[PDB]
Amino acid sequence: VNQHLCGSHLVEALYLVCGERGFFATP
Amino acid sequence: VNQHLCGSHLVEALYLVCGERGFFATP
Amino acid sequence: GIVEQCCTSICSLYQLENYCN
Amino acid sequence: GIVEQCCTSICSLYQLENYCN
Ligand code: NA
Secondary structure, three states, rough: OOOOOOOHHHHHHHHHHHHHHHHOOOO | OOOOOOHHHHHHHHHHHHHHHHOOOOO | HHHHHHHHHOHHHHHHHOOOO | HHHHHHHOOOOHHHHHHHHOO
């Protein structure tokens, strides 16, 4: 399995981990 | 003069500063 | 992260460049 | 930044959380 987090996967990982939270650059 | 960089203005600031380096979350 | 440093607070060019790549 | 740490290389949960907010 690929353990790199790029593009959409990286966005997906931040959604998961950051929660309420938020992160750049979600609207 | 607002010195805060939020949302789309922060994305622009990164386009300007990062140039060819790129940055998350632009392609 | 960058929102706290550059949006909530004011950040420098050096800090901003931290968030490239 | 987050791309070199998490995309080019492999990053931990702690590193990834540094890029929230
Ligand atoms: Na970032």
